[PDB]
Every structure is written in structure tokens, then in C-alpha cells.
């Protein structure tokens, strides 16, 4: 009866993010010191199977992609995790046509989902962004993407 756990991810799966009261960060070291939108009480949803959970309630040491652990960039002493995507992560202001565009909007390089984890009950959902086109925060933001391949 239980479906696939959200800790399991496969390439081509559709991810659905919600970032309540999301704010703006000038630079995220997980994205090579580039602007990002981050929320404290964010929620992640897998569209294909319908599984969803709050980002702060996920033990990111256990999550797997295609049977492999996520690539972790320990930047400035903070451990992040990578959920890659095929294409750019599409995000917009919640409930409205207000829509956002990522930092690498001009290139063919794909985007990724980054989450900072303390190991307890505090996780921050980071989505790539170019500027405050949806606002400097706290602003509700909703996102969507399709999971990509394992890092090489």
C-alpha cells in the first residue's frame, strides 16, 4: 500500500517545491556564490507518485538518486546536498502569474535543487535565481522541475 518514499529519486521524476515566506539570498556557495531563493518551512513534492514532505523534516543523509547518494558540496563548513534536474528549475510566485527565472537562463546548462542540513530539524530549500524579480521576501514561491542524471 505505501508508495515509493520521497527519499528515493529517479532521473526524469517531476519534483514540486513550495517555499513559504521565501526570501532572497545574495549568493549561495552551493551554486557557486550565486543568488538564490531560500525558505525555512519549505515543502518538497514528487508529482509522479504524489509523495510530499517538508524540507526540514527530511534526513538528507538517507536520500538517494538512482540508488546513489547525492553529491555533497561541503562549502564553508556547511554540508549541502544536490538533487539534479534535466533543464532549468521553473519557479513562480505562489497563486499568481508572477513568475521567476533562474540565474543560468541564457545557457543550456541544467539546474539543481540544493538543501542545507544541520543534521537535526533545520533544512533550507535553495532554488537558483537571478534577482528579486519576485521580491526580496518573505514572498511565497512555487517551483517545478524534472530530476536529472547522477553526477559524473
Amino acid at each position, epitope marked *: 500500500a505505501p508508495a515509493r518514499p520521497i527519499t528515493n529519486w529517479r532521473s526524469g521524476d517531476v519534483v514540486w517545491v513550495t517555499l513559504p515566506s521565501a*526570501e*532572497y*539570498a*545574495q*549568493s549561495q556557495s552551493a551554486m557557486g556564490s550565486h*543568488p538564490a531563493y531560500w525558505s525555512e518551512e519549505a515543502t518538497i513534492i514528487n508529482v509522479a507518485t504524489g509523495q510530499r514532505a517538508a524540507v526540514s523534516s527530511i534526513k538528507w543523509d538517507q536520500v538517494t538518486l538512482n540508488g546513489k547518494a547525492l553529491h555533497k558540496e561541503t562549502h564553508s563548513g556547511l554540508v549541502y546536498y544536490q538533487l539534479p534536474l534535466m533543464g532549468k528549475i521553473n519557479f513562480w510566485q505562489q497563486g499568481t502569474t508572477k513568475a521567476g527565472y533562474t540565474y543560468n537562463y541564457n545557457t543550456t546548462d541544467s539546474d539543481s535543487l540544493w538543501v542545507w542540513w544541520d543534521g537535526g530539524s533545520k533544512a533550507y530549500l535553495y532554488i537558483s535565481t*537571478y*534577482t*528579486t*524579480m519576485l*521580491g*526580496a*521576501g*518573505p*514572498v511565497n514561491i512555487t517551483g517545478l522541475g524534472a530530476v536529472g542524471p547522477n553526477p559524473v
Partner: antibody
Amino acid sequence: QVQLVESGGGVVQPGRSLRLSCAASGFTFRSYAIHWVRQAPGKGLEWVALISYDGSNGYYADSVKGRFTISRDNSKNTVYLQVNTLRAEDTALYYCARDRGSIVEPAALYIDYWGQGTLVTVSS
Amino acid sequence: QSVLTQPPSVSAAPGQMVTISCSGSSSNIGNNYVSWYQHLPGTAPKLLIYDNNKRPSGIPDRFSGSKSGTSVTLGITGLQTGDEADYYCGTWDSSLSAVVFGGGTKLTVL
């Protein structure tokens, strides 16, 4: 107690330079962009300067360009506002405040907390 | 003389409504976001409206703001003697590459 205090006020001879040190406590300096803002007596607010999170970007105002200089020392968690050749128009209570907004074409400013201000009283 | 223009002053009876206009070109208020600031005398100015439509935590619900085209307007419901201060706009000028604040409006009660 999150605070962002300013020091370096007092009566100043005209045509001289000061360093408006800005000590920051209670928050991470490198996650914020610190603004500088002055209010002349009997007048309103006027934005002065701006520095990025890592000190890479330094932004000035049209009326303060050339005479003003912004600097950042993230090791000491203190942003430095170097005034130069103070005039009769900048005898103002220099507030300082932190911002977590952006600067690109659709910029949104969040100048969250403003300090109590330092009073430059350039006169005889 | 600021890019963002405001009425010099405004007044109303206690408990009433006031509104402060704030104009500008597309480079600052048409493209970028705007914010409002209250400067009670003797203390540091506060943030009451951000993102042209939202307020920080702790700001009373009686304050409101909304942008109509290349212009924004402050809205204060239920005027009080305590809420007598100077209100300023705040936004980024992409063309000028600088932060432009509002000219200044003074709330009074009589």
C-alpha cells in the same frame, strides 16, 4: 541583541575626512549588504552608499560620488564609510542599516534595521 | 527634488484615513520594487511597507500600500496621535544605479 552601531561623529573642521566605523553584532555580516543613510536637520532622508556582502561591489550616490568611499572588512564584521572633504550639506545624522535585497533591474530593497545614527556636525 | 515625489504634508482627525501619493518613472517604481519608511522624531526610522504590498512583522495592520502603474500610494487607516511622523518612499533606480528615497510627507493631527 542584534545591533549595528556607528561611531565617528563630532564637530569637524570643514574640508577634512572621517572614517564612520560601523560595528555589527547579533547577525552574520557576510549575509547582509550595509547601507549608509543621512538626514540633514530640517530635511528628509537621503541614501548615501552601499556595499555588497563580500565587498566586491561598492555603490555611491550622485551627490556623494567622489567625496565618499565605502569599504568592507568581513574579518572584523565592520563596514567602513570614508567621508572626504565634508561640506555644509552633510552635517547630518548618518544612520547605518543592513539590507538583504538585490540590485539588478527588478531590484527589491529590504533595509531591515537602522542604527541610531552618528551626528556629523562639521562647523567651527 | 528627489525622483520619487511625495506631498509635503497631510492631516486628518484622529481615527480617520489618510493616503500619501508617491510617483516616479519606470526605471525606479515601474521596474523595481518600492518600500515605505516611518521616521518618528527622536528615534531611528522603521520599515512598515516592503515589496509595495507587504509589511514586516510587528507593523500594525492599519498601514497598507499598493502600486498603480509607475506610482505607489501609502494608506493609513485609523489615524492616531502616536502615528504622527515622517513617511518616505524607497526604491532602486536601475537607470541611476542608486537607491532613491521618497521626498517626505509629514503626518499631523488637528
